[PDB]
Each structure stands twice: as C-alpha cells, then as structure tokens.
Design a protein around this ligand. Structure first.
Ligand code: AMP
Ligand code: CL
Ligand code: MG
Length: 843
C-alpha cells in the first residue's frame, strides 16, 4: 500500500531531523590500557573543562538573538558502564552515544561514556557549536598529558593564549570590513557560471528531496602507488591532496560528461598560529572549481589545480554560507548547493562506519603510518549501489597510477576500466550467439511453413482469404514472370501498391525470383516516389491498378492486380528451384529508404541472412502460434512491416491486412482488433498514446503482444497500457533500419515500471557497444554512442559508398575478419543489470 504524496514527503521531512541529530555532533573514543586509576581521570577531565571557555559555554535566546553565556567552571558528566558482550554491545553503545542529543540551553555540551570492559573504553562526545574535527584531536592531546600529570595542573603547566569568544569578537569585526568584501568578490568571480549540479551517472533517479541515507566503502593506495604519487607531487610542487583532487575531478568530469567539476573540501581555517590548540567551531568549506576542457595533460591539470588550491586557501576566511547566498540565493532541494562531491584530507581507537551522506560522494583520505594512503568513500545509498561506488574507487586508483606512469599524456584518455568490467561490457553482456540455419532465405521460411500447413489461413483482407498454398502458388506465378524480366540476385523490384492481398504476393514473388523489393508507399508525394524509383534502378516495377507511377528508363512495369495482371496467371504455380533463381542468404532481401536526416533519402540494402535472424529471434522470444493473428497496420515503407509480413508467415499464423487509410475512421482499429481476434500488433509510442486514449480500448482484452519501437517509450505510457489492458505483454524494441528493424528488446513485465523504459539486451547473434569519441568502451553508466555489430548490420547505402564507409566501420571486437559495426548516432548507456538505456541523439 503506497503512501500519499503528503505522507511520503512528510516522512522524508521527519527523517531530516533524525539526520540532524547525528550530523551535528563530534564523536570519538580512546582505548585505555593500563592500571585501573580512575583517581586521576576526574582531575584530568575537569582540568580541560575549565581551561577552555567553550567547554562550559551555554546558549539561549535573549532580546531576539542568541546570546553567549559564560558559565561557572563545572565538572564532567561521565556515565558508568560495565560492558557485557562484544559485537552488539560496543556497536550499539557507540552509536547511541553519538546520536544522543544535547541541550544548548542547560546541560553541558561535552559528554562521556566510560566503562570497564584493567582495560577501559573511554568514549567522548562534543557538540559542533563548541568543537569540530580538530577540536577533538587537541582534546586528545590535553587528555593524554593531563592524565600523565595526574599519574606522576591544566592552565599553570601550559596556559591557552586565547579563547573562542575573542575569535568570535574578531570575526564580527572582520566580516564588517573590506577584506570580507574582497574575499567575497574573488569567490563570486571564481565560481561564476559554475555547473550547479554534477551529472554523475546514478543507478536510480535523483529523489525530489535529498535522501541522507549513506554507506561507505574502504579503499587504500598500496605502498607502490603512494610512493609514486609522492614523487609525482614533488615533481610538480603540489601536495598529495592536490594530486588526488586533480585525479578525482578528472574522473568525475569523464564519468559525468561535463567539462567542469566543483569539489568541496573542509579546511581547519586556523591559519593564525594563535588558533592552533584551541577548541571551537573553526572548520570552513572551500569550493574548488576544476576545468578540464581543451584536453589538458597530467602536468597541465596539476598546474591548474596548484593555482586554484593555493588561491582558495588564501581566501578561506570567508564563511562558505556567504559564498552560497551570493552566488546561488536560489537553490534546489534535491542536492547540496554549489558542489555535491567532497574531498577531505585527514593528514596525521578509531571511529565507526559512516552511515550518513550529506553529499553524493565524500572521499576521505589520510596518510597512514607505513606511508600508505587509506580512507573511505561515503555515498548516498539512494543514488548509487555499492558495486558502482567500488568501480568508481577503482577508476580513481587506475587514473592515479597512469598519472605516475606518464605525467605528459592527456589525462582524459588514461585507461580506467578494470579488465573484469571490460570483459563484462564487451563479451559477457554480448553473449548472444544462437545457432540458426545460415543457409535459409526469407521466402524459404514461408515455403517451409506452406509444406507444414498448406490449408491453414495465411492472409485476410476485407473478407477475402488466401491459404498458405494459395498464397505460395500466386507468388510462384508472379516470381516466374519476374524471372522472365531479368529479376535475380541483388536486382531490385520496386513495389507501389496500397494494402491488399496482392501486396504480400508481390513481396514474396520478388524474394522467390531472387530479387530485393523496394516499397513505394503511394501516400508519399510523386517527387519522392520518382526519386526512389530512379535511385534504386529496379528491373521491374510492380504496380497496383490505379497507380500512375511511370519509371521509364527501360524499367519493366507489371500490373499487380486488376485485369492487366491476368497474363502472368498463365505461369505455372510450381516453386522455382534453388538454382533457377540462384539467391543466397548474403544477397539482398529489400532496399528500404530512410529520409536520412535532412536531404535526399538513402536506400538501406538489407541481406536475407540478417532478416532471417531477426525473424527467427522474434519467434524464439515470443512464440507466435499458428492459431493467432497479426495485424498488418504499419505502412510497408517502414521496416517494422518486415516482421509484420514475414513473422506470422514463417510460423503458421495468419496475417490480417488492415484497410488502406482505414485508421482515418477513429473506431476502425478497435473494431478490427475485436472482430478479427488480433493478438499481436505494433505501435510507435505516439500512436500507442492515441490507442490507450481511444474509446473502446478496454474491449481489446484478447490482445497478447504489443511491440513498441521507433521512438522513446515513456514509462507513464507503459503504465497506462497496463491499466487499460492488464493482460497484454508490452515489449520495447530498439534498432535503426541499418541494423535490420530491431537489435535490442526489453519486456515491460516488471511489477514497477521505471520512467525511462530500457531498450533492453541485444537479440540473437547481435552485439551492442557504447563507445566514446575515440572508439573506447566507457564505464558502466557513462553515456556514449551506440554501435551495433553482428549479422543484422546492413550491407550499406545503395549508391552512397562514402557515407557507407563513414557509418559502417570495421568491427574490432567480434574476432571475425570482415565484420562491421554500424554507428547509430544514438546516445546510450549500460545499466548495472546488463540492460541498455536510450538517452537521445548524439547531436
Ligand atoms: N525503442 C526505441 N527507443 C528509443 N528510440 C528508438 C527506438 N527505436 C528506434 N529509435 C530511434 O529511431 C531511429 C530510427 O528507428 P526506426 O524508425 O525503427 O528505423 C533509431 O536510429 C533511434 O534513434
Ligand atoms: Cl558517396
Ligand atoms: Mg527499428
């Protein structure tokens, strides 16, 4: 049972308060090994309390603003504990200790949980309004020294030079001065026009409200990589933090497809030596804008990062909140402002696993004792899966290694893919090899079905019917007349007719005569039909009676129906032998013209073998049975009609030829579906929308399969079809004409359909590749240009050899000499489940 919209948002609002309870505290712990001497702790504990004025400072409202109340020096509030277990005891105790809220009014802001587990567990906690990250590190310096003094006080040994109230009084004057304005002018200039949101590929769409659920992984740079990065940093004058910042910004810009990347970094902001050792809120955030346009080298990028990091650390006094309200006074609610990725360098007991994510990714790294670099990468679980973050950390380590190998190469072309993912992308997700007969042509699939069911119904048109044997005999007669007119292998036969029984007779007869058919839709303007008729240079024009299209140019014209078609009824109805025609699977099956994009239409030459594979895959995936009917509704100038014609005829089903221009009657489609028991039909998504919006669509409960292709299928439309026809199996198919109708398919059978309906997995004997501008495979989730391989790649464009070599390129992956890929010009990406997602056009 789903929650309402008001209930769903109110839940996320209530959990932001739970996120605030844990993220506004500074937890920590220390393992104590030594003689049981509590007699020295309380003396050492209260000594650090009274030493720093912030440890006992209270806050409250007075005269419309929060006031600072310096309190009389008090004692430490420690709770006695006696541990009872191990795993569940320590993990839960240490968790609720950090999540236990304080009170800014009364009650102290330093909290401690001590326990005897000889050996004691000393948990400490401070509030962020009186401390930060460093403030606990100096809390460990004093606590360790004061216990030593109380074992062998505070201020007399080494007094503190200042207290936080003096820093706040100084900041109040600095914020009003002209140095604040100039630092505000630099940050307004540095981050002007910066990308508001990084487009890192996410495994799930970004929620409307930011989800603070977080998880983390562990990553380390081994002794070799940490050593090489130190030498690389020495050679370019950068520190080890700047070298990692350059690599991470280089990785993110490559993964997100953006030129610039903004990465945040927390700084202590204790620039003045007086503030060192003091306890309080000093940490500030700097937004680092790294540009990567122009394809810089490793040295050029490190020099850019060297300039921007130094300039950022010189203007680190301005609060980051004032940077936002100046640049972005109008911000979003689904992501953090200015930046969404943070890199913290923690150069130096241990804390627990970070389960909160204030940003998309937060990379924490530190320099270990053995010279190695270790840390964690915390990610928002609502955006990324764990395996995606692990591959992300692998890319960074791979990119850092390449920078050490050569600091002069282009940084954005360094290989980052691991061998496991590369093999999965290229081979494992393309394991579509299926054993189909590579010796059969398209018309022979029909002829084999004629022998199995000669008296079964094959064609239906406005009451007229043709059985499999009757259709085959009619096609054989016309095929012999075509053979007498020079039709043979690779020769074209133009066909100009409206939908009728004779349309299918013509197509089968051309294929039987060994030629390739060229569909000429009479609805197109005469100028277009005359160009395609001249460009294809056919041997014969099969013309329906009433059509006035005249080719000239020595082209033979045969009447397809009417009284003028009677002469070729005298031909014998027997089948032409395999040698009488001479056609083979590598010969052309049809030439279908696409309008290109802007200009003259181009004839796509498609061979028999690819069409047979496309048809044989469709039956294996969907199992069309002889008793079913398919509706021939798509104009035969579109290659969708190819499987509408030849899929049912190859398996024993019947094909219902829709009325010409019949859908002009708004009720014709529904009445024909019900009246003819239509089980399978095709829609382009724009036409499917009109179908689910049409009157009486719910009467079509007998429909079995709806194939969608040609456009992007919106998930809302797919979900609308379920509500109207709960029984129909919806399938999303993708593929251009140059790859034989379709090459990927995705069943819309999931219990919950996404808004972006995937185009799916490659079909039988077909391969798919997502490549960058240099023909290299991109990481999972990264957008790139779709390339198609396998048997369904067309021969090329009829009469345009230069465009053919431009879009039909050698296949370097198939391991087969002579194989070719088709560059689609479409943008796509792999999902982590091995399915493809259409994203749009490359241009
Ligand atoms: N299922 C689909 N989803 C999104 N786009 C598609 C799909 N099928 C085809 N296209 C686009 O339409 C172009 C031509 O497809 P077609 O009309 O089937 O030849 C392709 O090159 C793609 O850009
Ligand atoms: Cl050309
Ligand atoms: Mg297609």
């Amino acid at each position: 049972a789903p929650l309402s919209f008001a209930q769903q948002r109110l839940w996320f609002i209530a959990q932001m308060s739970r996120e605030a309870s844990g993220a506004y505290h500074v937890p920590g712990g220390l393992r104590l090994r030594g003689e049981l001497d509590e007699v020295a702790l309380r003396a050492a504990l209260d000594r650090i309390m009274a030493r720093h004025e912030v440890l006992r400072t209270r806050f409250e409202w007075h005269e419309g603003e929060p006031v600072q109340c310096i309190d009389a020096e008090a004692r430490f509030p420690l709770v006695r504990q006696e541990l009872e277990g191990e795993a569940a005891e320590l993990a839960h105790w240490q968790q609720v200790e950090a999540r236990s809220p304080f009170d800014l009014g009364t009650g102290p802001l330093i909290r401690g949980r001590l326990l005897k587990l000889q050996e004691h567990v000393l948990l400490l906690t401070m509030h962020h309004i009186v401390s930060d990250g460093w403030s606990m590190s100096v809390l460990a310096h004093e606590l360790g020294t004061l216990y030593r003094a109380y074992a062998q006080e505070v201020d007399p040994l080494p007094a503190l030079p200042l207290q936080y109230a003096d820093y706040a009084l100084w900041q109040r004057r600095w914020l009003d001065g002209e140095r604040q304005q100039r630092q505000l002018a630099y940050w307004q200039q540095q981050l002007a026009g910066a990308p508001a949101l990084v487009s890192l590929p996410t495994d799930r769409p970004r929620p409307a409200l930011q989800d603070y659920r977080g998880d983390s992984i562990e990553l380390t740079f081994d002794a070799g990589l940490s050593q090489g990065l130190r030498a690389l940093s020495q050679r370019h004058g950068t520190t080890l933090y700047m070298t990692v910042l350059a690599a991470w910004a280089a990785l993110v810009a490559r993964l997100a497809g953006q030129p610039e990347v903004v990465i945040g970094t927390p700084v202590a902001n204790r620039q003045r030596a007086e503030l060192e050792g003091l306890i309080g809120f000093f940490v500030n955030t700097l937004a680092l804008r790294v540009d990567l346009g122009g394809e810089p080298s490793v040295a050029g990028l490190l020099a850019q990062v060297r300039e921007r990091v130094l300039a950022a650390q010189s203007h680190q006094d301005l609060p980051f909140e004032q940077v936002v309200e100046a640049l972005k006074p109008e911000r979003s609610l689904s992501h953090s402002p200015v930046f969404q990725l943070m890199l913290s360098w923690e150069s130096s007991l241990a804390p627990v696993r970070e389960r909160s994510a204030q940003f998309d990714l937060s990379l924490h790294l530190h320099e270990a004792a053995d010279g190695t670099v270790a840390g964690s990468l915390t990610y928002a679980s609502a955006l990324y899966e764990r395996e995606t973050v692990q591959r992300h950390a692998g890319y960074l380590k791979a990119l850092l290694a390449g920078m050490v190998a050569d600091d002069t190469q282009p940084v954005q072309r360094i290989g980052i893919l691991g061998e496991a993912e590369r093999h999965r992308l290229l081979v494992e997700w393309n394991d579509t090899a299926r054993e189909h007969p590579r010796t059969v042509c398209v018309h022979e699939l029909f002829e084999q079905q004629v022998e199995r069911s000669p008296d079964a119904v094959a064609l239906v048109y406005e009451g007229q019917q043709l059985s499999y044997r009757e259709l085959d005999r009619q096609a054989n007669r016309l095929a012999r007349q075509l053979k007498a007119l020079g039709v043979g292998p690779d020769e074209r036969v133009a066909v100009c007719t409206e939908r009728c029984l004779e349309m299918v007779v013509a197509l089968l007869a051309v294929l039987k005569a060994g030629g390739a058919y060229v569909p000429l839709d009479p609805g197109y303007p005469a100028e277009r039909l005359e160009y395609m008729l001249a460009d294809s240079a056919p041997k014969v024009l099969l013309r329906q009676s009433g059509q006035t299209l005249e080719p000239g140019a020595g082209v033979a014209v045969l009447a397809l129906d009417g009284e003028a078609s009677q002469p070729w009824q005298a031909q014998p109805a027997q089948r032409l032998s395999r040698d009488d025609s001479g056609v083979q699977p590598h010969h052309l099956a049809y030439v279908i013209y696409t309008s290109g994009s802007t200009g003259r239409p181009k004839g796509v030459m498609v061979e028999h073998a690819g069409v047979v594979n496309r048809l044989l895959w469709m039956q294996r995936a969907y199992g069309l049975q002889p008793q079913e009917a398919v509706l021939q509704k798509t104009p035969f100038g579109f290659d969708v009609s190819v499987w509408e014609f030849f899929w049912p005829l190859a398996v024993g089903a019947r094909l219902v030829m829709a009325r010409p221009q019949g859908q002009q009657d708004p009720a014709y489609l529904v009445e024909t579906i019900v009246g003819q028991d239509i089980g399978t039909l095709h829609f382009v998504p724009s036409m499917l929308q009109a179908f689910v919006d049409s009157e009486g669509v719910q009467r079509c409960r007998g429909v079995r399969r709806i194939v969608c292709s040609g456009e992007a299928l919106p998930g809302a439309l797919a979900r609308r079809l379920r509500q109207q026809l709960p029984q129909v199996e919806l399938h999303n198919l993708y593929g251009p004409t140059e790859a034989t109708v379709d090459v990927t398919a995705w069943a819309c059978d999931a219990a919950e359909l996404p808004d972006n309906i995937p185009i799916g997995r490659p079909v039988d004997n077909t391969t798919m590749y997502v490549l960058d501008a240099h023909g290299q495979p991109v990481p999972t989730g990264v957008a790139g240009e779709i390339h198609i391989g396998g048997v369904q790649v067309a021969r090329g464009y009829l009469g345009r050899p230069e465009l053919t070599r431009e879009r039909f390129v050698p296949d370097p992956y198939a391991g087969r000499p002579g194989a070719r890929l088709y560059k689609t010009g479409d943008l796509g990406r792999w999902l982590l489940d091995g399915t493809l997602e259409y994203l749009g056009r490359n241009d």
